[PDB]
Design an enzyme around this catalytic site. Structure first.
Site, PDB file in Angstrom:
ATOM      1  N   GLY A  28       2.687  32.387   9.518  1.00  0.00           N
ATOM      2  CA  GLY A  28       2.530  31.982   8.140  1.00  0.00           C
ATOM      3  C   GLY A  28       1.087  31.988   7.719  1.00  0.00           C
ATOM      4  N   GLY A  30      -2.033  29.588   6.383  1.00  0.00           N
ATOM      5  CA  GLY A  30      -2.651  28.270   6.210  1.00  0.00           C
ATOM      6  C   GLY A  30      -3.670  28.311   5.081  1.00  0.00           C
ATOM      7  N   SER A  31      -4.271  27.168   4.761  1.00  0.00           N
ATOM      8  CA  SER A  31      -5.293  27.107   3.702  1.00  0.00           C
ATOM      9  C   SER A  31      -6.512  27.983   4.028  1.00  0.00           C
ATOM     10  CB  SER A  31      -5.743  25.660   3.477  1.00  0.00           C
ATOM     11  OG  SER A  31      -6.264  25.109   4.671  1.00  0.00           O
ATOM     12  N   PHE A  32      -6.779  28.131   5.322  1.00  0.00           N
ATOM     13  CA  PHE A  32      -7.936  28.856   5.867  1.00  0.00           C
ATOM     14  C   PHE A  32      -7.684  30.356   6.069  1.00  0.00           C
ATOM     15  CE2 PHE A  32      -5.208  26.898   9.019  1.00  0.00           C
ATOM     16  CZ  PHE A  32      -4.813  27.994   9.775  1.00  0.00           C
ATOM     17  N   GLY A  33      -6.422  30.717   6.266  1.00  0.00           N
ATOM     18  CA  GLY A  33      -6.070  32.081   6.625  1.00  0.00           C
ATOM     19  C   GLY A  33      -4.758  32.162   7.374  1.00  0.00           C
ATOM     20  N   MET A  34      -4.458  33.368   7.842  1.00  0.00           N
ATOM     21  CA  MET A  34      -3.196  33.666   8.507  1.00  0.00           C
ATOM     22  C   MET A  34      -3.121  33.022   9.887  1.00  0.00           C
ATOM     23  SD  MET A  34      -1.809  35.335   6.201  1.00  0.00           S
ATOM     24  CE  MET A  34      -0.303  35.992   6.918  1.00  0.00           C
ATOM     25  N   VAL A  35      -1.904  32.673  10.295  1.00  0.00           N
ATOM     26  CA  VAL A  35      -1.644  32.130  11.624  1.00  0.00           C
ATOM     27  C   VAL A  35      -0.639  33.027  12.330  1.00  0.00           C
ATOM     28  CG1 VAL A  35      -0.898  30.128  12.962  1.00  0.00           C
ATOM     29  CG2 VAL A  35      -2.061  29.806  10.752  1.00  0.00           C
ATOM     30  N   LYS A  55      -4.842  30.407  14.901  1.00  0.00           N
ATOM     31  CA  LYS A  55      -5.277  30.215  13.521  1.00  0.00           C
ATOM     32  C   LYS A  55      -6.491  31.109  13.293  1.00  0.00           C
ATOM     33  CE  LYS A  55      -5.821  25.734  13.975  1.00  0.00           C
ATOM     34  NZ  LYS A  55      -5.948  24.277  13.682  1.00  0.00           N
ATOM     35  N   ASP A 157      -0.804  10.139   7.752  1.00  0.00           N
ATOM     36  CA  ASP A 157       0.183  11.068   7.164  1.00  0.00           C
ATOM     37  C   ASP A 157       1.278  11.397   8.181  1.00  0.00           C
ATOM     38  OD1 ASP A 157       1.396  12.752   5.241  1.00  0.00           O
ATOM     39  OD2 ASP A 157      -0.054  14.376   5.507  1.00  0.00           O
ATOM     40  N   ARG A 161       7.156  16.581   8.534  1.00  0.00           N
ATOM     41  CA  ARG A 161       6.395  17.819   8.309  1.00  0.00           C
ATOM     42  C   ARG A 161       5.122  17.908   9.174  1.00  0.00           C
ATOM     43  NH1 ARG A 161       5.921  14.487   4.043  1.00  0.00           N
ATOM     44  NH2 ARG A 161       3.846  13.517   3.974  1.00  0.00           N
ATOM     45  N   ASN A 162       4.649  16.769   9.680  1.00  0.00           N
ATOM     46  CA  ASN A 162       3.453  16.713  10.532  1.00  0.00           C
ATOM     47  C   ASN A 162       3.744  16.488  12.028  1.00  0.00           C
ATOM     48  OD1 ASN A 162       1.568  17.295   8.476  1.00  0.00           O
ATOM     49  ND2 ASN A 162       1.649  15.177   7.755  1.00  0.00           N
ATOM     50  N   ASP A 175      -0.616  19.654  14.891  1.00  0.00           N
ATOM     51  CA  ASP A 175      -1.982  19.992  14.527  1.00  0.00           C
ATOM     52  C   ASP A 175      -2.289  19.351  13.175  1.00  0.00           C
ATOM     53  OD1 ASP A 175      -4.475  21.221  14.461  1.00  0.00           O
ATOM     54  OD2 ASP A 175      -3.652  23.218  14.030  1.00  0.00           O
TER      55      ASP A 175
END
Ligand SMILES: Cc1nn(C2CCN(CC(=O)N(C)C)CC2)c(C)c1Nc1ncc(Cl)c(-c2cnn3ccccc23)n1
Length: 308
Positions: A28, A30-35, A55, A157, A161-162, A175
């Site tokens: 998928g 992520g906010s930073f890039g592909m995983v 990541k 949190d 989902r976490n 993570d």
């Protein structure tokens, strides 16, 4: 007239040679890039090769973003617990920038739970998880949380989902921060402090925005409710604003349909209005330890020599 404000990433003993990493399947964005899923050589003791999650931050991203990514990811370096997803290495030299994590093939727990819901096709389906399976998940999550509390952390949190689910169905604390952007409607921004998981938050946290291990226990109750409902939205049919008022004034989630009595009893201990009357994660584990699978004694923080 000032302190310098420049952030850097300093390569350390977690650095791994790029030549030891290969990437295959896309997991998928992520906010930073592909995983991606992949394989890493020499990152786990006695394992010549290990399946890993990778990541990435690609060549187009800014160096500021790059450094932020590495420093955020590095928080996971401090932990070594069977029930917390492990960081295995970093490739900060050259591009793309990589962070190598333990692979959790069955995804985040919210996704996993939702995958257990019957399809609208009238095909045969696995029955909902048994009490014993739900208790196993509960104990694993509680063990990971006890470990984090023992290391003086507040999660803030905790939610399905976490958490993440392994190939062998072991649930671990995930993570940090990797799914909040995906399940965006699980958060509500009311002011400073930003996007908060209001449907997972304790009354005291809703009132003044402070989080403690006691509020993590509250959220743990909500996770048990998620497991028992296969990840329905808590307080469904209440707006974000109505949730704040409902919980602060003493309202609780209802016992899910066909929820075993034992599990709902545990939820009620977690949802005591007074935080001081809630059990600790260690006390939660103590109460269910007889129902855990035998191998729990060999891998858990609870039974380890670090639990003192
Ligand atoms: C969290 C997860 N999700 N998945 C997949 C997703 C695709 N499918 C979902 C489905 O239902 N399909 C029908 C495809 C199977 C589950 C897998 C293997 C994982 N494991 C995993 N382990 C470790 C990490 Cl660090 C991450 C991860 C971190 N950031 N991050 C951002 C995006 C994605 C993953 C990650 N992810």
């Amino acid at each position: 007239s000032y302190f310098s404000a420049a952030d850097v990433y300093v390569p350390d003993e977690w650095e791994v040679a790029r030549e030891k990493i290969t990437m295959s399947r896309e997991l998928g964005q992520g906010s930073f890039g592909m995983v991606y899923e992949g394989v890493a050589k020499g990152v786990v003791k006695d394992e010549p090769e290990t399946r890993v999650a990778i990541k990435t931050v690609n060549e187009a991203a800014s160096m500021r973003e790059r450094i932020e990514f590495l420093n955020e990811a590095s928080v996971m370096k401090e932990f070594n617990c069977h029930h917390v997803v492990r960081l295995l290495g970093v490739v900060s030299q050259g591009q793309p920038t990589l962070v190598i994590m333990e692979l959790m093939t069955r995804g985040d727990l919210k996704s996993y739970l939702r995958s257990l819901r019957p399809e609208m096709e009238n095909n045969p389906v696995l029955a909902p998880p048994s009490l014993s399976k739900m208790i196993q998940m509960a104990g694993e999550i509680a063990d990971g949380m006890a470990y984090l509390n023992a290391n003086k952390f507040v999660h803030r949190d905790l939610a399905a989902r976490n958490c993440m689910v392994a190939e062998d169905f072991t649930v671990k604390i995930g993570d940090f921060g990797m799914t909040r952007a995906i399940y965006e409607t699980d958060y509500y921004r009311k002011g400073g402090k930003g996007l908060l998981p209001v449907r997972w938050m304790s009354p005291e946290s809703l009132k003044d925005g402070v989080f403690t291990t006691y509020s993590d226990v509250w959220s743990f109750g909500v996770v048990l409710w998620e497991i028992a409902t296969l990840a329905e939205e808590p307080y469904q049919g209440l707006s974000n604003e109505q949730v704040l008022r409902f919980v602060m004034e003493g309202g609780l989630l209802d016992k899910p349909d066909n929820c075993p009595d034992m599990l709902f009893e545990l939820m009620r201990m977690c949802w005591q209005y007074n935080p001081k009357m809630r059990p600790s994660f260690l006390e939660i584990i103590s109460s269910i330890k007889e129902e855990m699978e035998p191998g729990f004694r060999e891998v858990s923080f609870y039974y380890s020599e670090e639990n003192k």
